[PDB]
Amino acid sequence: EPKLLLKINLKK
Amino acid sequence: SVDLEKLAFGLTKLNEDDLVGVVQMVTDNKTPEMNVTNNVEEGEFIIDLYSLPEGLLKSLWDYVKKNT
């Protein structure tokens, strides 16, 4: 069972 | 009903500011049950669209369509 996880890296 | 995989793909088509706006909308509406990871130290978010309510998913989808 596939799930797309959305990882978002912000400016630090 | 939002197609979650098309939503996830479409979210990567946003520019940096609009994707930050997605992060803003999600963190402003999030509850522990929607399983949003926000590593505050590392400035990173992991969104599990499969744990979001349908109204928020619809808002995200319309947001993607409006900004692409």
Residue numbers in the entry:
A (entry chain B): 1392 to 1403
B (entry chain A): 176 to 243
The authors write:
The canonical NuA3 complex acetylates histone H3, generating primarily the epigenetic mark H3K14ac3, and consists of five core subunits: the catalytic subunit Sas3 (something about silencing 3) and the nonenzymatic subunits Nto1 (NuA three ORF1), Eaf6 (Esa1p associated factor 6), Yng1 (yeast inhibitor of growth protein 1) and Taf14 (transcription initiation factor subunit 14). Taf14 is a core component of several chromatin associating complexes that regulate gene expression, DNA damage response and cytoskeletal organization in yeast cells. The plant homeodomain (PHD) finger of Yng1 binds to (or reads) trimethylated lysine 4 of H3 (H3K4me3), whereas the YEATS (Yaf9, ENL, AF9, Taf14, Sas5) domain of Taf14 recognizes acylated lysine 9 of H3 (H3K9acyl)11–14.
To gain insight into the binding mechanism, we co-crystallized Taf14ET and Yng1EBM and determined the structure of the Taf14ET-Yng1EBM complex refining it to a 1.9 Å resolution. Each Taf14ET monomer, colored light blue and wheat, folds into a three-helix bundle and a two-stranded anti-parallel β-sheet linking helices α2 and α3. Dimeric Yng1EBM forms a long two-stranded anti-parallel β-sheet (one β strand is colored yellow, and another is red), which pairs with the β2 and β2’ strands from Taf14ET monomers and is restrained through extensive intermolecular interactions. The side chain amino groups of K115, K119 and K124 of Yng1EBM form salt bridges with the carboxyl groups of D223, E219 and E191 of Taf14ET, and the side chain amino group of K123 of Yng1EBM shares a hydrogen bond with the backbone carbonyl group of E216 of Taf14ET. The Yng1EBM-binding groove of the Taf14ET dimer is large and hydrophobic, and two molecules of Taf14ET almost encircle the dimeric Yng1EBM.
